Amino acid sequence: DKIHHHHHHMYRIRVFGDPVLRKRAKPVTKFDENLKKTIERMIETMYHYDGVGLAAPQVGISQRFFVMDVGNGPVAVINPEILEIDPETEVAEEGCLSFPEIFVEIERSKRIKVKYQNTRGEYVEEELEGYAARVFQHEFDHLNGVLIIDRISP
Numbered sequence: 001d002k003i004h005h006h007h008h009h010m011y012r013i014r015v016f017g018d019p020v021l022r023k024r025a026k027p028v029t030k031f032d033e034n035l036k037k038t039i040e041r042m043i044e045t046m047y048h049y050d051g052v053g054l055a056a057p058q059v060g061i062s063q064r065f066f067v068m069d070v071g072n073g074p075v076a077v078i079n080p081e082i083l084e085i086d087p088e089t090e091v092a093e094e095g096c097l098s099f100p101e102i103f104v105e106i107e108r109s110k111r112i113k114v115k116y117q118n119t120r121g122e123y124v125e126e127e128l129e130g131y132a133a134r135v136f137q138h139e140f141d142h143l144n145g146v147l148i149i150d151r152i153s154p
Contacts, residue, residue, distance in 0.1 A: 010045040011059035013097050016147065018060075021098060025055075025062040025143040027079045031121035035078070039119055042067045043074045051097045053135045055142035058098055066139035070132045077116045080140055083125075084113035091153050094138060098147070105153045108134045 014020055028035060038061070046054040046067055055066035065078040091107045111129040114136060118124060128136055141147065 007048075009041065010048050011041055013045065013049060013054070014058050014060055016096075016099050016149075018098075020057050020060050020062055021142070021147060022145040023057065023062045024145050025057055025064045027064045028117075031078075031117075031119060036119045039065070039067060039076045042076075043069075046074070049097050053139040054097065055139045057142050057145075064143045066142060068135050068139055070135050076119055077114075077136070077139070078118065080114055080116040080136070080143070082112050082137070082140060083115055085109040086111035086129075092134065094134070094148050096138075096148050099149070102149075104148055104151075106138075106148060106151045107153045108137050112136065 042054055042056070042059065045059060046052075046069065052070060053066060053068040056063045064080065065076070066080075067074055067076050069075065086109045088110045089107045090110050091105050093103050094106050095103045110133065111127065112133045113125070113127050115123060115125045138148070141151075
């Protein structure tokens with residue numbers, strides 16, 4: 001291609017094939033200004049690519065955090081844990097900024113109980129369902145090196 005737009009400040013999104021997407025992310029331990037700035041860049045990047053979720057590995061950082069926006073504004077999730085998963089599930093089509101133009105159908109629990117920290121290290125615990133629950137699981141999967149293609153529904 002003969003013309004290009006160089007982006008700065010926001011992150012470059014890693015594409016399937018980059019092994020950082022398969023490496024199990026490590027937990028965040030430092031809750032400082034840098035983590036905050038990173039979260040801001042994560043949100044900038046997510047919105048810029050029109051995504052609803054973006055996990056650290058997708059920007060080359062194998063740490064356990066991601067951001068997401070399921071319609072209520074951006075939520076920063078650090079060191080998440082999925083405490084409970086409803087046995088009831090639902091299948092829907094899911095894409096991924098790291099897989100340009102690939103969409104597959106994936107079964108996800110309808111409701112989950114999660115626990116995570118905010119940028120100040122404080123814990124938050126909450127119940128999520130429907131779309132919110134789906135996006136959370138999808139982004140959570142990234143932290144364990146799991147991608148949508150590992151979950152195609154039969």
